[PDB]
Write an enzyme that holds these catalytic residues in place. Structure first.
Site, PDB file in Angstrom:
ATOM      1  N   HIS A  41      -1.063  18.874 -11.327  1.00 39.53           N
ATOM      2  CA  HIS A  41      -1.602  20.149 -11.429  1.00 39.53           C
ATOM      3  C   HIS A  41      -3.327  19.861 -12.262  1.00 39.53           C
ATOM      4  CE1 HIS A  41      -2.060  21.659 -15.341  1.00 39.53           C
ATOM      5  NE2 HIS A  41      -0.359  21.554 -15.674  1.00 39.53           N
ATOM      6  N   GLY A 143      -3.545  23.972 -22.285  1.00 41.55           N
ATOM      7  CA  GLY A 143      -3.925  23.051 -22.527  1.00 41.55           C
ATOM      8  C   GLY A 143      -2.576  21.445 -23.503  1.00 41.55           C
ATOM      9  N   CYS A 145       0.297  21.691 -21.869  1.00 41.06           N
ATOM     10  CA  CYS A 145       0.873  20.546 -19.948  1.00 41.06           C
ATOM     11  C   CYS A 145       0.751  18.810 -20.961  1.00 41.06           C
ATOM     12  CB  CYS A 145      -0.464  21.020 -19.570  1.00 41.06           C
ATOM     13  SG  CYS A 145       0.118  22.933 -18.951  1.00 41.06           S
TER      14      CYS A 145
END
Lengths: 305, 304
Positions: A41, A143, A145
């Protein structure tokens, strides 16, 4: 003595954390050998996330659209591909700090350490459990992730988790390192029902054993029980049904303490029915379920790496 | 979102952990530049610990009686001295993995990460608080001695703790990196009264603010209070008295949430008087006090 929620030493994994950037989105990447793994993503704008066609989107992307940063050093990206929900960016340099590692898909109830990062730089480390509904209650900000979960089994880092998503509920979902989500979740920004969650019964029992080993014994009764009778109470309070496999796993603890597994189940039973009367067990006012039997044993024999 | 008790990444400290051995006793040592720091009770047998004369004992020891092991590699010891309750073994090799570091003596109420070791090898890592009575509730088994506590401020490791002993209580005591014990404790195996412990009021408040930021808001009341009125209740429940310095430290949190520090104190007050009625706050059925305001802010702005 004393019993704390302990994470594995993060050193070996710190050396594999990098920053990945594509347009607006910046998140974390795992750099092993000459390949950097990150959530796919990363290639989506905020608009794209509502309903992304990842194949179509990846096709528009070129190597040069990917800025990969290991601290001061920028890595040259010489290829990109997609495996399930993870991006595999091929780089011209092999990570010299690559540890011995496996990719593992863990079961629900099992635990791991998470190294939370922001812009590819380690922020902190915490131990947690894969909930029966395949979510995790963790600490993941904008962030974070690409942050990964792992275990150390002797000298080998077994990577089991990469964080992708925060559900509207405020819990977290993610994949194994092959890019397969745990549970029914997808890397789309839509409403997503996690299952009814349950308490990891085997872990609670292990924790109770930990308490006794550390001299916290107030909850032991002179009752016993059967699997079936106990499980009837467990179902009622949304506890994972206890099986023989679970009883077998708690054997070593049972042995050291001289308390039978069914005897301990009987104590747990009474605690569910009567609550704790505002008493603590190892400094907690509720029943902790993020310690596996192995975790308890590891911490109670002083296992190192 | 979500709120976890997080330890600092242990990497930089792992590289400084070594094994130190003297006679029977083996424990952990911290290797920074060309000096290895370890607890001085490394020189004591089990018998010696009841009543050790450390000077007399150290005098019998020579350089070569100290076996220092950094993983596979054995380090040559070229000098030894005693600084308070720590040994400083000088070695012929500077640790090439020495990070930028300070030695700090922390205040009670402050938090740090502990890297628990056995035979100089990292076992695991957990965050904890220096209790107002200068003890810590940790995880320390046979040979965990020499394990250190630290904070990371960017790239600088601020070492604040080295574990020495377990009190009969089951809690833990230790020194700063100059060898000075936190609190009234000594490196002897005897009965040792720790103080009356108190709840770190400022930390609880910080944690309450964390809860609100993460949407857990049930405990907010329509009341307010004063410092003095609140502190009168605090004293009663063995809470650290709240000062203006504490109010000042909670300002940024107060600002983001739009809830005044005294308003929050008022909510805390009601929770002490009425308890929690078996409700949770951020998944805890008690009031957590091992998060500093800085800790809460660090986790709420995504600081590396």
């Amino acid at each position: 003595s004393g019993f704390r929620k302990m994470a594995f030493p993060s050193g070996k994994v710190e050396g594999c954390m990098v920053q990945v950037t594509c347009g607006t989105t910046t998140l974390n990447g795992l750099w092993l050998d000459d390949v950097v793994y990150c959530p796919r993503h990363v290639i989506c704008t905020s608009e794209d996330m509502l309903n992304p066609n990842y194949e179509d989107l990846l096709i528009r992307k070129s190597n040069h659209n990917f800025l990969v940063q290991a601290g001061n050093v920028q890595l040259r990206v010489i290829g990109h591909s997609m495996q399930n929900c993870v991006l595999k960016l091929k780089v011209d340099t092999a990570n010299p700090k690559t540890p011995k590692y496996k990719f593992v898909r863990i079961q629900p109830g099992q635990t791991f350490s998470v190294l939370a990062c922001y812009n590819g730089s380690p922020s902190g480390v915490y131990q947690c459990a894969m909930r029966p509904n395949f979510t995790i209650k963790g600490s993941f900000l904008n962030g974070s992730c690409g942050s990964v979960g792992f275990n150390i089994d002797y000298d080998c880092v077994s990577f089991c988790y990469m964080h992708h998503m925060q559900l509207p509920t405020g819990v977290h979902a993610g994949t194994d390192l092959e890019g397969n989500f745990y549970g029914p979740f997808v890397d789309r920004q839509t409403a997503q029902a996690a299952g009814t969650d349950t308490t990891i019964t085997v872990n609670v029992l292990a924790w109770l054993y930990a308490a006794v080993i550390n001299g916290d014994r107030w909850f032991l009764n002179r009752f016993t029980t059967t699997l079936n009778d106990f499980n009837l109470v467990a179902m009622k309070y949304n506890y994972e049904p206890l099986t023989q496999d679970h009883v077998d796993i708690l054997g070593p603890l049972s042995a050291q303490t001289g308390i039978a597994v069914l005897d301990m189940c009987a104590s747990l039973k009474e605690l569910l029915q009567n609550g704790m009367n505002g008493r603590t067990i190892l400094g907690s006012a509720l029943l902790e379920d993020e310690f596996t039997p192995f975790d308890v044993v590891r911490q109670c024999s002083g296992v190192t790496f």
